[PDB]
Structure formats: C-alpha cells, structure tokens
Design a protein around this ligand. Structure first.
Ligand SMILES: Nc1ncnc2c1ncn2[C@@H]1O[C@H](COP(=O)(O)OP(=O)(O)NP(=O)(O)O)[C@@H](O)[C@H]1O
Ligand SMILES: [Mg+2]
Length: 300
C-alpha cells in the first residue's frame, strides 16, 4: 500500500466553512485548505466522523481508501486524526445524484439516466476487482462531478442506523456483506434514479422490510421503465445472491440500452433532451473535469 497517496493534514492547514449534510457515519462540510506559506484558499470536502479504533488501525484502512484509482470512484485524499477523524476529499459543487435527479425531475433524459447506471456499475466493478465491498451504495452516495460524470463515494466507512431499505436480505438477516449484496443495493440505486429520487418502500417501517422481502414483494416498476429495465432490477433482488447479475454484466446491459435509449425508457419529451454537444462537453471538462474518463455511450 502506497502511503504517498494519503496526505496527513494538521488542523491548522484547513478550516470547515459550511455544513453540506450528514448521514450515519458523520457530517460533511465544505472546507478550505490553505497550503503552508501560501495565501490561496482551496475548496475541499471534509467529513467529520461521529465516533471519534487506534490511529494505526484507522490509518491502515485510510491507505486503502486513498489507493482507489478509477474515474467513477472518489478517492480519499487526506486525513486529520485528532480527538476526531476528519477525511478530506475533492468537493463536488453539483452534490449527490439523489438530490440532482430530484431537482431535475422534469429535465432528465433517458440518455443521462442510462449512462449514470453504466458509470455506477463501472465504479462498482472496479471495487469488486480490488476485492473491496462497499456496504452502503445508494443514490445519496453517488456524487455528480459533472452532469455527464458521476462517482461512487464512501465505500468501507464501516471499517474506521443501518440502511435497511438498501440492504440485501442476507445482510438484513445475518449482516453478511459481499459483492453480490452490493448488487442488491445497486438495484435499489437504479430504482431511485428511475423514479427521480423517490424513497424506497415509502411509509413502510424498516422493521417490516425483511418479512415483505421474504413474501416476494419488491420495489414497484417505475413509470418510465420498460419491462426489460425492470427485469434487471428484479434480478438484483433475487434471494439467491449468486443468481443476481454481476457488475461486469450490468455494464454491458446498460451500455447496450444507452445505445437505443427510447426503446428502454419512456420519458415525456425525451426527444427534446440530448447529451451535451462536443462543444458543451469540452467546456465543462476544461472548467470542472480534467481527469481521464471513458466516452459516454451515445445513441445509434
Ligand atoms: N465530496 C462531496 N462534495 C459535495 N457534497 C458532498 C460530498 N460528500 C458528501 N456530500 C454531501 O453531503 C451529504 C452528507 O453526506 P454523508 O455524510 O456521506 O451522508 P449520506 O451519504 O447522505 N448518508 P450515509 O449513507 O449514511 O453516509 C451527502 O448526501 C452529499 O449531499
Ligand atoms: Mg455518503
């Protein structure tokens, strides 16, 4: 494990400026990094974990989080260990994908929806290749770097209030977490995207979820989803973990759909919605996204 990928910060080097939100593991702040001797203030994201393990143990798993290198996975950049644990990552002005699809509920075309599914599956496939299990995949944990480029965040924060409605049944009943339970959570994530950010099992108590799942009930077909798309989601929620799709296969299936998007999603006014022109993509990347990344899938 290359320790050069993780910078240890002193509390004087940075400052938390504004709360962006919180979850089961901590509170996220927009912050500023001031490099020693410089007068510039560089925006960063800072997550202060709630618990506040020995430092060496934490630091050991931080190195792993800092070692991920994939265009669709957020890398841990720095850490500050004191009376609390603070994690430094790149700040994402657009915020999480869950908020984004809610705010653009009437502006989002099939090409974006299907490409996001592809990118999320690419990020998860990379984690599986690293033999790393996420355990907390959800639309709230996908960040928008640009509308054309999303990234998975917060994998393995357990190491270092359980999300029952995203969890595989075997995780609920037995706290077993695997790549195939990550696939279940991927299914729920895709459902959140396709419903433009609806809450899964709305109005149903968390305590009743396992019995509902055992009865064979699942999240309902989203109004924009054709049966082929919905069957993929349903396959992610099969009781037998090994009969669920693999992330490798999901990349291929959603990439195929992205090439003929109106055949797979039905969205009012979809023809009036395209992926950005080369001109607009070039501008976005120049200003916000210089990193390398696979081409988005365009319609045939
Ligand atoms: N790097 C970031 N840049 C900008 N906003 C961020 C960043 N990381 C997190 N956020 C936002 O901060 C919110 C709170 O994050 P977080 O503490 O990870 O809780 P959560 O992901 O929503 N739920 P949980 O699954 O329990 O961690 C997220 O939902 C995002 O909206
Ligand atoms: Mg999160």
């Amino acid at each position: 494990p290359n320790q050069a990928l993780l910078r240890q910060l002193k509390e004087t080097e940075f400052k938390k400026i504004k709360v962006l939100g919180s979850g089961a593991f901590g509170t996220v702040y927009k912050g500023l990094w001031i490099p020693e001797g410089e007068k510039v203030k560089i925006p960063v994201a800072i997550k202060e974990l709630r618990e506040a393990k020995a430092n060496k143990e934490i630091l050991d798993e931080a190195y792993v989080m800092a070692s991920v290198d994939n265009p669709h996975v957020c890398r841990l950049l720095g850490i500050c260990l004191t009376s609390t644990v603070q994690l430094i990552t790149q700040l994402m002005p657009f915020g999480c994908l869950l908020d984004y699809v809610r705010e653009h509920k009437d502006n989002i075309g099939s090409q974006y929806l299907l490409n996001w599914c592809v990118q999320i599956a690419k990020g998860m496939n990379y984690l599986e290749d690293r033999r790393l299990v996420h355990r907390d995949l959800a639309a709230r944990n996908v960040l928008v770097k640009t509308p054309q480029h999303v990234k998975i965040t917060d994998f393995g924060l357990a190491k270092l209030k359980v999300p029952i409605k995203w969890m595989a049944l075997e995780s609920i009943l037995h706290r077993i977490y695997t790549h195939q339970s990550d696939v279940w959570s991927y299914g729920v994530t895709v459902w959140e995207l396709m419903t433009f950010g609806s809450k899964p099992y709305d109005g149903i108590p968390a305590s009743e979820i396992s019995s509902i799942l055992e009865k064979g009930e699942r999240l309902p077909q989203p109004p924009i989803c054709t049966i082929d798309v919905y069957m993929i989601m349903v396959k992610c929620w099969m009781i037998d973990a090994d009969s669920r799709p693999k992330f490798r296969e999901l990349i291929i299936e959603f990439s195929k759909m992205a090439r003929d998007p109106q055949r797979y999603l039905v969205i009012q006014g979809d023809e009036r919605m395209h992926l950005p022109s080369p001109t607009d993509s070039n501008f976005y990347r120049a200003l916000m996204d210089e990193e390398d990344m696979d081409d988005v899938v365009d319609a045939d």
